[PDB]
Design a protein around this nucleic acid. Sequence first.
RNA 1: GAGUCGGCAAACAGACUUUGAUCCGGAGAUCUCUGAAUGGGGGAACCCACCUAGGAUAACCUAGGUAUCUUGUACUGAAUCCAUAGGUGCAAGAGGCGAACCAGGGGAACUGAAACAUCUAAGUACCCUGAGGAAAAGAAAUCAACCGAGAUUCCCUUAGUAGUGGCGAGCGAACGGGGAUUAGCCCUUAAGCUUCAUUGAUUUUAGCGGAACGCUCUGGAAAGUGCGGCCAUAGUGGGUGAUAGCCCCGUACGCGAAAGGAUCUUUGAAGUGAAAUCAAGUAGGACGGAGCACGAGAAACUUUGUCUGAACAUGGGGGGACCAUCCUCCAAGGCUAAAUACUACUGACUGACCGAUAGUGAACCAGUACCGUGAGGGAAAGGCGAAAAGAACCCCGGAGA
RNA 2: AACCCACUCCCGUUGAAAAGGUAGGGGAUGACUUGUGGAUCGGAGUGAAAGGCUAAUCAAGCUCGGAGAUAGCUGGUUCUC
RNA 3: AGUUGAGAAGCUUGCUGGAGGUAUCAGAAGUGCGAAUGCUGACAUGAGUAACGACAAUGGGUGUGAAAAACACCCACGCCGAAAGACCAAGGGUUCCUGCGCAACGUUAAUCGACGCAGGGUUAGUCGGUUCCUAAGGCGAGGCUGAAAAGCGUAGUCGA
Lengths: 77, 44, 103, 92, 60
Amino acid sequence: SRVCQVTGKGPVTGNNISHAHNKTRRRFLPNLQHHRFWVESEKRFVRLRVSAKGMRIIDKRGIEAVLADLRARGEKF
Amino acid sequence: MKRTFQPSTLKRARVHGFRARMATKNGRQVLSRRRAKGRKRLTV
Amino acid sequence: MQKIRRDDEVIVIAGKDKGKRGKVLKVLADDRLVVGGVNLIKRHTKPNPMLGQQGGIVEKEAPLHVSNVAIFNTETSKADRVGFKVEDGKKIRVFKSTQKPVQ
Amino acid sequence: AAERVFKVLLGPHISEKATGLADGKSQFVFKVATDATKLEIKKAVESLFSVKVQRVTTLNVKGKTKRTARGLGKRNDWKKAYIALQPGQDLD
Amino acid sequence: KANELREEKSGPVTGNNISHLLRDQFNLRMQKATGQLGQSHLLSQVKRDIARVKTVLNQQ
RNA sequence: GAGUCGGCAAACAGACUUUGAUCCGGAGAUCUCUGAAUGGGGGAACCCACCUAGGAUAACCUAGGUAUCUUGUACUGAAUCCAUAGGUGCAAGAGGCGAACCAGGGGAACUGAAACAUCUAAGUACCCUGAGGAAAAGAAAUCAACCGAGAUUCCCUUAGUAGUGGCGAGCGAACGGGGAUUAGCCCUUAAGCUUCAUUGAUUUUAGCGGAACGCUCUGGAAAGUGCGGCCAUAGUGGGUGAUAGCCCCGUACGCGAAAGGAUCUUUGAAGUGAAAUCAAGUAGGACGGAGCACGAGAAACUUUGUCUGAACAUGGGGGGACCAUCCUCCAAGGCUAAAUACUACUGACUGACCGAUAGUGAACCAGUACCGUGAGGGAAAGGCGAAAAGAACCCCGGAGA
RNA sequence: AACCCACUCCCGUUGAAAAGGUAGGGGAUGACUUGUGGAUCGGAGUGAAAGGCUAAUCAAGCUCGGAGAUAGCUGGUUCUC
RNA sequence: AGUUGAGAAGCUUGCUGGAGGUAUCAGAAGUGCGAAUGCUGACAUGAGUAACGACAAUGGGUGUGAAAAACACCCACGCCGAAAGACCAAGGGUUCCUGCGCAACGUUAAUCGACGCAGGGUUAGUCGGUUCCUAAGGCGAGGCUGAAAAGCGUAGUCGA
């Protein structure tokens, strides 16, 4: 489903207030894309569907640290 | 003057049967309602 | 644990046939007793087929309630309540007015 | 099994049709256990009545349905074997 | 009774006892099927005798 | 401790029991097929298998296994060299059902506003996912005003108040009190909770004993009438042929357990709590939302879908825009009993509750009969007599009614 | 002709029938008729199109819930002086 | 039935009934019914009226019986005969057959019955199914996707 595999960001819900203040149920989707991340210590790519906030977290913490606790949680890659 | 119930035991058992009800979520809760009401048949 | 067994002399306390003595034949499960010689019933019986035979009006005895009979004493010749006072390891049923065992 | 010889045969079905068939042919109609194959009620007749069986035919019987107060009640569906024997050799 | 069945009757002795008194149940049902069974309590009690030998065959 | 072979269902057979049946409780044994149904299928209660071990004479039979997933581990190993995917075997665990209670995900419309859009109804109903006997929350980056209080939950108030609102319909606090409850431990490794083994103790699953009334009248029958008693840690219980403390079962009151279970308590043991090391893509901010009683409004505080993005105890956030000065706390790691909610289910007791059109839909063989293709809808039907003593026999009649 | 249909009259309308019967009528080797199994479903299907059909129900099926919707409307409201 | 009160109503009694009732004064209400095209049962009126289900069609004899227009048998008459005949699938589920029956059911009567009670009857290597195979379509390990529920699908394995 549309959850980031790094952050767990799924879709959330809210409203669509008009100028006459009609509220309508919409939904807020994460900016999740597919990205291949190079791991040196495995000599391959892993391809995980992450948000852009997850991309920034990979940039800050390293792919090895995030890929360590993806599998403690028990994700695919 | 053909009427609206034309009986077939196979179409009976495949639309309304036990395994058809227990294949889906809503039919499993048909059986749990119809078992909670205490009915003798529960698969008709 | 019951007050009245079969091989047991009783009198009838407050029935039709009260004051009459008898021995207990049958102790029914709905706490009613068949007692010999009292509550005599005239049952009209059809005679039987299959070469069976029972005659017509047979005269048997009806069950009466266990509250309607009391244990007869044969020492004071009175109705006496029974109890379970005397024992060493074996419960005997004992008379209550005189504390002497029912036997 | 060492058992199941004593469990399959449930008694001779007595009827006018069974009687005339036991007299005329050599065929004896037994009521048998409702899950009994043709060969385990052939070995049982050969074991218990000490005969040579040449054929067994079978037929399930539906139990009849009786109406009363509190609805329809059904009798038990039962099973029925015809035991063809050699033309002498009548079983007892 | 059952402690009579435990008294030195082994695996094979009670095992032989079952197939002995299953002949009894067979012959009682054979007599029930015809008219030639007068006393009907034997039919009920061979069941519970087989039940007792199969009870004492688990426990050893 | 004397009868019994359950009920409608009374009789009848063949029988069982003082050498102790039936019955009642505890522990076992068996436990067919279906159904999460799990060897593979399938139209539920059916069909067809494989492997191992043992037994069986051209036919089988017994006892074990044989689902998927997740986690852990062993062996094996593709493109591709190394090793990864993958695959085979083991171990452990899961799945389903249940009236409610709880925490979350998604979420109406009728209605009201005397129309109706904001708003309300209402985060309700419904659907979904988890957990437990409760859950959740919880040990101050909390409130107060220069005085102070100290976790959370629940109740009564402050108060229909301040606010909030097409400032309409409406929605609605807090400070401060009064209480129910009582505890805080740790990330230099703890309380606590589990599971075992023990230490005594208590309860529960069955039972045992359990006082004291006679005469008389009417009557079918006395418990009622008239008279005289007795018992009482037992007197407004049930039914016994009419209304009984003393006739029976009981009651107050004492006793009681081979064996199980449950709660509490010792005193060890293995675990867990437990995430590592005081918290960074975090606080803050810009847009778009949601919540806070608060319709973004002077709008604080919380949360975040997108985009960004700090300081480091001479830091940092809160005190309802914002700014100084004071006051008060230490967020980005956790775990925590009680007070609290609920009752499909048991047991006892109770009712100015109903008494057969009432009370459950259902006193009776009722979620039945019946109606629908289904989901689903859904009845009607109690009373002889104290006891069957349920009418032997005769007559008319069709061996009737 | 069977089969499928349903143009006309009459009957029937409390029917033999909740859509028929009897006389006649149209197609009848095809864009035919039909069995058996399967697929599509409620602002949603399917429609050689008529708002037709979707279990005798259709300008939004049935059932159960929100729900005792709402009704400035209609009807009713029980003994005595 | 009598009687007493302005009334709602009260009191006394004959018969029935055969086990409960409640002066008084207070407390409490599921507290009073003729209407709501009110609910549910019983029963009227219409009325012993209309009908009795295709206008193939019946007439005697004999029997059985309590009783025969209707049952059975005989004689004769009609009617169908691309069915009103024989049969298979589906659907039904004992209706089949034989004894005994006739209350109710049968649009009348019934001795008859698709009705009641009780018995019996359904025999397969070859006919149908299972088993083997697949079509449409279903389900679908893993897998892709989706707030959840789930959707779609590969290997597969069901499905005439």
